[PDB]
Design a protein around this ligand. Structure first.
Ligand SMILES: Nc1ncnc2c1ncn2[C@@H]1O[C@H](COP(=O)(O)OP(=O)(O)OP(=O)(O)O)[C@@H](O)[C@H]1O
Ligand SMILES: Nc1ncnc2c1ncn2[C@@H]1O[C@H](COP(=O)(O)OP(=O)(O)O)[C@@H](O)[C@H]1O
Ligand SMILES: [Mg+2]
Ligand SMILES: [Mg+2]
Lengths: 518, 50, 466, 70, 49, 466
């Protein structure tokens, strides 16, 4: 119907475009420092506009910058791109629009800048609405208590450190300890749990983010995940605004939702890959803007910064949509100094901690979680009733072992009861070891912990507990699918150990122990 | 599937290249047409509202 | 009035006013923005010719240099009166809960007042009957005195706060005020409203008898700094009415670090850890209006976070300079299900001396502390070796220590949902007599695990001796 | 006069047109300090700047706007 | 094969792009003075590829 | 493009230019000198009215406050091409050895380029062979990977970096780009030149196949800072040519320290412990250009000097995030006369995955670590008990661990001067079998001392024959 195109055209051009001479506001750069321009005194600029720097001779691209400090006769604007090109006297025009990012269904399974520009080279983003960055928190009456669990897929977290929809759980650790491993496992575990994952990748390497994206691609995890990226080479402004763009996307998922696997999904998960490097980027931006340095040279408002970032993660009630947004910030502690500035800030503003230690990691134990100091302050509310009932015994026994952990090299030479406790603790700790990219579904973890808590693995030697778990799981998958289905179906039951599930599980485990030899 | 996505992206990248070439050709031709056309009345457009 | 905003550097802004009518310090200049959404600020300095530096107390993102700035002529004014009961406010005094605006008819008072003058101070210290036996005995409150609650995250702090609100609402008329300084928008904005609305010591809900003010985490440093003063201004009306008020502050260390961040933003020289140079004075402006005047009294119970674990750090040090009691809640008393999870050997209180609480109270408190200390020491004897090694008069000490530890447990009127036992309020004198009787006599022939959740010694005796 | 301004035109401006546009800008002050530029890469357009505000009705602007379809 | 097809499509559709270039050239300035060599003439001169 | 020098304070120079032709941010100011030579500063900050603040790149003890300066228009330009092969350069890309100046026909490129985009990045983690076995089966290389060495003050980092260049010139061609950031003149000069010229293959010295760019603690901070970028340009040329270039950086610790000094002299606000605010971004721009594109790949190793043992120090702390593999040299092993002196434990590698280096490679690497990890656990047992009270089966573990620890040592073609016998290149997949045989127990009868320095297991067998 070309007549429709003819009617739509020929009217907007004649009397739909103002074409009115009016004077739009601009300024001129008067000093370019370390990625910071002053833009002279461009007036009528909102406190965080994005200035435009139109192309000039020797540059056919447009480079954007954030106007952060609005001084009298000076607007010190941090540049988002490369400052090699902007020169003194360059005319800069200010858009009236605050930073915005494309969001929604279309931006799914794509690697994008904080500004939303693709960096995957797979075409432009398809979208129709842009959500402004830097939004106010949901508020007081808008939220609901965290109840629905977020099955991360690794036994230690899902049993001892619950993560629920809306919770802000911190992965605090040191050097390489599996923080990205724990996060990437959590993301991979959401294949059919109605969640949209956001990875932010602040200050990482291009090769590292490429490797993570390849890992998600390999496990078919790019039909439900977004990846933002502001690598190390990128200017400090891009890293500074990266997590805010990521959580803007997450907020769009939370409020409106997206059509995932033929159903509307309003739950989101966002993993700020390094709030430590984010704070470092913000410190660079502040110090280059000559803002006053606070403790440890971080500006006075880094706490406010991470606070407004993280408090946008919430569990909206049914009135406002029922959506959710779980934040999983990650921090790179130095020498396990948890008392440093940003670690203290983030543990104070977050709802729980997942302490990853280098000692346990180098101790041969892959998942280096520290149950003693790690805490999820949501508690059992973020566990299914099944896992909640099963894991109390696990927590008690692990606590007992940690109390008597000094006797591993003296376990045999002790009381019978103490020897039994130490043996059980060693078996449980060996059981919590898990390889990488191998998430365990909730029913599987429930079955394994039901076995372990009850006196079933006592016959099993300690070094073979992991192999026992692996082949027992394979047995349940192939030999007794109905047991897994039954456990999954009544996971929410108030009294999970019902007679039917109890006897089915007992029969399955007894059959496996009879068939196998250890 | 990866091969199929590559063909789609290759066509898309070819589409972008064609669009850029067409834009450059239009700019070169637009300059020629404008010069032969003349630009006497451009001043009148600068005061429709100012 | 009618200044113009000149500079915007993060939260800090500078507004230029005429030569006359320059706002004073703490004059709450408001910026019209959006649709009536005012970015209330707080002037902190006067510079040059009418330029005044102010803290954002809001987003300060949609602002542009050159906007109109309106001076209110007074510090931030917050509503005060019964109209604030059962409502939830931010630092600015606007109700953030679902209900509507307070309305112009309700009185509004400046946030920045001066503490009571020297004459108004109570010359002597009067004990505050909190009702909870362990607190009333081991770490008694002081009428108009501060208190610290160093307990584990999830050991019963909120339940204790609810019980204190219930007692101050029931026995004496009273009210309560909750100042969630830097309180998380989940564990504070929501994990509290539901708990205080469901919790009903009497027909009235704890929520209906308490004024709630939240300086949320996401708010800028100015809000977290002045939310405590907003809470104090809201409580001071009820104190001026002659009532006795409990002011609960959540993690006063967040108030300290909000002040530190504000000082750093203003460019002041840092001090001794990086904390604000005006740390003592800031902690004095707050926490000095928490005093027992002639007309009424504001008692307070302030949660405190120790940086690292340094009781010598300047923040907890300056807080301790203004503390009259300390309660160390412990999870170890929580696995053994005692509701007040208070460690009697770590919790202390200044008022626990013979002159103020009397001779008998001090004697029984010292005796309880002594037997508990003996039991703690004999931990190793009982665990390493066993009960048989315990000598005569030391088996009895441990035996009594068990019964003392259980007898500290009390059934709260707000705990009748968790456990179902009816509430009980044991007066201080009843606690003194009960514990004296338990120590110098009766209670040995009665087996332990029968002092569990009982009030006076008469209550346990009559109830569980049948 | 008090304010400074700058003007750009694709072609070399004739004197009569220069005076015409000079007196056209009488909204502010009349014959303000105008530094007429050419920038021949500009096509059939007029970029006038007065104070810290610019006007850009040049054809390069519309060409870029159409190019945004990319 | 994709590269070969694209080159074939680009070469085959060059006239169509010229047809679209004429429409764009006509709408390049929203007008065309009659005293000109012609938008089609300039496009032919700038046909290039 | 002609300016005038305004101020000169230390190695920081302020020049003024006409407003229309102020140099960009990273242009070379190129101050001419009377003798005919020139001082080539670089702009770092455009401030004021056509005033630029620049770093010296040179002595700056022979210049006044009015010298004319010619802006180059382009950043520091360095030669690139086969012509710049087997030549020694400084930060400005000027040949500092005795040979004549590079001709004007050699292509010159700016040192400030952009790293490869995200799309160009490659995910295939192909292993890169080195010949130092303990590096090959503890923490192997990765093409387009940032290996690094740690520890310092005596442990052989520079020597293993020379050995790698020699062995990788034996392997294929291995055109190596040595980036001497603040290298000692003795270490970098007349020892790298001497050793590389001595190391001969096919009547063409390894020196003639590698390009060396030496900054100098003696040169000002700016030269030591930008020397790494110069070497990166030199290698990026060959990467664009498609060849697999190998770039070596000496003591990135000195790169960080030079950055800190430049920042302090420039008046930048100090960050952390007096370090530059741009610590992360400088390492980002230096390290991000080292990667593997589809066409070529700049594989690399970067030596690091950790002060004492403080891995928290800002230089190693910054560089850790960019490493695909880390090697930890310890003095305790050096006291054991081990050329590699690498610690088999605490030296990881991201490609130590069954399906990247072969199925047996991962399990034999872990088994060797398991054997060595056991030896540490019972070190005190062996110490005071002299292997007594051992489980015997553990004695074999002990014996195999000591044999393994001695067998990691390899005569370095670059260590022949000190004491060693001629070097041996031990190809991976030819000596992973050797270690598998050792674990299996084929060398359970050979004495311990015969695994001292031999390379393959066949070599120690042949030695044991005699
Ligand atoms: N759960 C795991 N199972 C097996 N291997 C693991 C596991 N977690 C980590 N690893 C190993 O440790 C390496 C480093 O882990 P990872 O990158 O996840 O840690 P990190 O703390 O995020 O590190 P970084 O700070 O360097 O980004 C992984 O490449 C893998 O080799
Ligand atoms: N492979 C080796 N063989 C013999 N001696 C070595 C070897 N590697 C290092 N050394 C000793 O270390 C010294 C130089 O160490 P070097 O490689 O410069 O370490 P760094 O660069 O950290 O100072 C030499 O003088 C020598 O004594
Ligand atoms: Mg990581
Ligand atoms: Mg060295």
């Amino acid at each position: 119907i070309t007549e429709e195109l003819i009617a739509r055209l020929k009217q907007g051009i004649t009397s739909g475009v103002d074409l009115q001479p009016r004077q739009v506001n601009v300024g001129t750069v008067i000093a370019v420092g370390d990625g910071v321009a002053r833009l002279s005194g461009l007036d009528q600029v909102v406190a965080s506009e994005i200035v435009e720097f139109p192309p000039k001779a020797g540059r056919n691209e447009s480079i954007y910058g954030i106007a952060l400090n609005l001084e009298q006769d000076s607007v010190a604007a941090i540049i988002l791109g490369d400052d090699e090109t902007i020169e003194e006297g360059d005319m800069v025009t200010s858009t009236g629009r605050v930073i915005s990012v494309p969001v929604g269904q279309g931006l799914l399974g794509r690697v994008v800048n904080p500004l939303g520009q693709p960096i995957d080279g797979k075409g432009p983003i398809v979208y129709e609405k842009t959500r402004p960055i830097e939004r106010i928190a949901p508020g007081v009456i808008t939220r609901k208590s965290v109840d629905t669990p977020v099955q991360t897929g690794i036994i230690a977290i899902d049993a001892l450190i619950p993560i629920g929809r809306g919770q802000r759980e911190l992965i605090i650790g040191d050097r390489q300890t599996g923080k990205t491993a724990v996060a990437i496992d959590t993301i991979l575990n959401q294949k059919g749990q109605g969640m949209v994952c956001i990875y932010v990748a602040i200050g990482q390497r291009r090769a590292q983010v490429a490797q993570v994206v390849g890992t998600l691609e390999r496990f078919g995890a790019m039909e439900y995940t977004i990846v933002v990226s502001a690598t190390a080479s990128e200017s400090a402004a891009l890293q500074y605004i990266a997590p805010y763009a990521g959580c803007a996307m997450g907020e769009e998922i939370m409020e409106n939702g997206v059509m995932l696997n033929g159903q509307l999904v309003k739950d989101a998960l966002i993993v700020y890959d390094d709030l430590s490097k984010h704070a470092v980027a913000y410190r660079q931006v502040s110090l280059l803007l000559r803002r006053p340095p606070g403790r440890e040279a971080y500006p006075g408002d880094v706490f406010y910064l991470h606070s407004r970032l993280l408090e946008r993660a919430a569990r909206l009630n049914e009135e406002y949509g029922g959506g959710s947004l779980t934040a999983l910030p990650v921090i790179e502690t130095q020498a396990n100094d948890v008392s440093a500035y940003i670690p203290t800030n983030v543990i104070s503003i977050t709802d729980g901690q997942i302490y990853l230690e280098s000692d346990l990691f180098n101790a041969g134990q892959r998942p280096a979680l520290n149950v003693g100091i790690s805490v999820s302050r949501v508690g059992g509310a973020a566990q299914t009733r099944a896992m909640r009932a099963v894991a109390g015994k696990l927590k008690g026994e692990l606590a007992q072992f940690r109390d008597l952990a000094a006797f591993a090299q003296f376990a045999s030479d002790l009381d019978a009861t103490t020897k039994a406790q130490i043996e059980r603790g060693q078996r449980l700790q060996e059981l919590l070891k898990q390889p990488q990219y191998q998430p365990l579904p909730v029913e599987d973890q429930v079955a394994v912990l039901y076995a372990a808590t009850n006196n079933y693995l006592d016959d099993v030697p300690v070094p073979l507990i992991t192999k026992w778990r692996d082949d027992f799981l394979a047995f349940l998958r192939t030999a007794h699918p109905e047991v897994r289905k039954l456990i999954y179906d009544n996971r929410l039951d108030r009294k999970f150990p019902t007679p039917e599930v109890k006897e089915a599980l007992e029969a399955a485990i007894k059959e496996f122990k009879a068939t196998s030899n250890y | 599937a990866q091969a199929e996505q590559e063909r789609i992206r290759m066509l898309s990248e070819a589409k972008s290249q064609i669009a850029d070439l067409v834009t450059l050709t239009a700019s070169r031709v637009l300059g020629a047409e404008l010069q032969a056309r003349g630009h006497d009345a451009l001043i009148a457009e600068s005061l429709a509202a100012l | 009035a009618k200044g113009v905003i000149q500079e915007i550097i993060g939260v800090v802004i500078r507004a230029k006013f005429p030569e006359d009518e320059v706002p004073e310090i703490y004059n709450a200049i408001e910026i019209p923005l959006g649709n009536g959404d005012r970015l209330v600020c707080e002037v902190q300095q006067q510079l040059g010719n009418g330029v005044v530096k102010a803290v954002a107390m809001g987003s300060t993102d949609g602002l542009r240099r050159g906007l109109e700035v309106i001076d209110t002529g007074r510090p931030i004014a917050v509503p005060v009166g019964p109209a604030t009961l059962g409502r939830v406010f931010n630092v600015l005094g606007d109700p953030i809960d679902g209900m509507g605006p307070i309305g112009p008819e309700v009185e509004r008072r400046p946030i920045h007042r001066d503490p009571p003058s020297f004459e108004e101070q109570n010359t002597q210290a009067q004990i505050f009957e909190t009702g909870i036996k362990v607190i009333d005995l081991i770490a008694p409150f002081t009428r108009g005195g501060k208190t610290a609650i160093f307990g584990g995250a999830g050991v019963g702090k909120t339940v204790v706060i609810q019980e204190l609100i219930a007692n101050i609402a029931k026995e004496q008329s009273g009210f309560s005020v909750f100042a969630g300084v830097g309180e998380r928008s989940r564990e504070g904005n929501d994990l509290i409203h539901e708990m205080k609305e469901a919790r009903i010591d009497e027909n009235t809900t704890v929520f209906d008898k308490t004024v709630m003010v939240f300086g949320q985490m996401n708010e800028p440093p100015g809000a977290r700094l002045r939310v405590g003063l907003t809470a104090l201004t809201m409580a001071e009306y009820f104190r001026d009415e002659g009532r006795d008020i409990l002011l609960f502050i959540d993690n006063i260390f967040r108030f300290v670090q909000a002040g530190s961040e504000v000082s750093s933003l203003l460019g002041r020289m840092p001090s001794q850890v990086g904390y604000q140079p005006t740390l003592g004075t800031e902690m004095g402006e707050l926490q000095e209006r928490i005093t027992s005047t002639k007309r009424g009294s504001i008692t307070s119970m302030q949660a405190v976070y120790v940086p690292a674990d340094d009781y010598t750090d300047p923040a907890p040090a300056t807080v301790f300079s203004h503390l009259d009691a300390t309660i160390s809640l412990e999870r170890s008393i929580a696995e053994r299900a005692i509701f007040p999870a208070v460690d009697p050997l770590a919790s202390t209180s200044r008022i626990l001396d013979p002159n103020i609480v009397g001779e008998e109270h001090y004697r029984v408190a010292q005796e309880v502390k002594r037997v508990l200390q003996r039991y703690k020491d004999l931990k190793d004897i009982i665990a390493i070796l066993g009960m048989e090694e315990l000598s005569d008069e030391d088996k009895l000490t441990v035996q009594r220590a068990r019964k003392i530890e259980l007898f500290f447990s009390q059934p709260f009127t707000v705990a009748q949902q968790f456990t179902g036992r009816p509430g009980k309020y044991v007066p201080v004198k009843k606690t003194v007599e009960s514990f004296a009787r338990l120590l110098n006599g009766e209670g040995d022939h009665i087996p332990e695990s029968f002092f569990y959740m009982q009030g006076d010694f008469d209550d346990v005796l009559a109830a569980y001796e049948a | 006069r008090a304010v400074d301004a700058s003007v750009t035109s694709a072609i070399e401006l004739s004197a009569e047109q220069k005076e015409r546009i000079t007196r056209e800008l009488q909204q502010r002050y009349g014959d303000v300090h105008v530094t007429y530029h050419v920038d021949p890469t500009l096509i059939g357009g007029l970029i006038i700047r007065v104070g810290d505000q610019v006007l850009d009705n040049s054809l390069r602007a519309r060409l870029s706007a159409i190019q945004r379809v990319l």
